[PDB]
Curated annotation (Swiss-Prot):
Protein name as annotated: Lysozyme C
Expression by tissue: In the egg white and polymorphonuclear leukocytes.
GO terms classed as biological process: cell wall macromolecule catabolic process; defense response to bacterium; defense response to Gram-negative bacterium; defense response to Gram-positive bacterium; killing of cells of another organism
Gene3D superfamilies: 1.10.530.10
InterPro entries, A to Z: Glyco_hydro_22, Glyco_hydro_22_CS, Glyco_hydro_22_lys, Lysozyme-like_dom_sf
Note: Lysozyme C is capable of both hydrolysis and transglycosylation; it also shows a slight esterase activity. It acts rapidly on both peptide-substituted and unsubstituted peptidoglycan, and slowly on chitin oligosaccharides.
Chain ranges of the C-type lysozyme domain: 1-129
Keywords: Allergen, Antimicrobial, Bacteriolytic enzyme, Disulfide bond, Glycosidase, Hydrolase, Secreted, Signal
PROSITE patterns the UniProt entry points to: GLYCOSYL_HYDROL_F22_1 (PS00128), GLYCOSYL_HYDROL_F22_2 (PS51348)
Primary role: Lysozymes have primarily a bacteriolytic function; those in tissues and body fluids are associated with the monocyte-macrophage system and enhance the activity of immunoagents. Has bacteriolytic activity against M.luteus.
Lineage: Eukaryota, Metazoa, Chordata, Craniata, Vertebrata
Organism, scientific name: Gallus gallus (Chicken)
Pfam families named in the record: Lys (PF00062)
Length: 129
């Protein structure tokens, strides 16, 4: 499914993402916008044999198991298919693990490139949260 901006803001808030690890809700909604355009089933294949899955485009080489990625890790201990559902919980729970692993949200290229250092609060303005 394709989430609406405010709809996603509310869902992510419900899942404890607001200021999780020092990143306000706006960062999360912005990341989703530029990673998957708020689409839960978006997927992208990379030159290294891995695929990005879901709304937060979680890569299969380190985070989930899709069963066809060369030297994969399954650091979130979840199948990649579970990241493609309408219920963002699995994606949120894995994203929390990724953000606690090293370079914060730099793990999401789109966020580095398009959100980092911008008024990310604009993504939550006009919503009831």
């Amino acid at each position: 499914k394709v989430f609406g901006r405010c709809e996603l803001a509310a869902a992510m808030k419900r899942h404890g993402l607001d200021n999780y690890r020092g990143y306000s809700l706006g960062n999360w909604v912005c990341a989703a916008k530029f990673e998957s355009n708020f689409n839960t089933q978006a997927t992208n294949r990379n030159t290294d044999g891995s695929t990005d899955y879901g709304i937060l485009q979680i890569n299969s080489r380190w985070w989930c198991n899709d069963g066809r990625t060369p030297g994969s890790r399954n650091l979130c201990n979840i199948p990649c298919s579970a990241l493609l559902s309408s219920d963002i919980t699995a994606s949120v729970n894995c994203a929390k693990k990724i953000v606690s692993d090293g370079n914060g949200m730099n793990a999401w290229v789109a966020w580095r490139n398009r959100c980092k250092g911008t008024d990310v609060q604009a993504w939550i303005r006009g919503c009831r949260l």
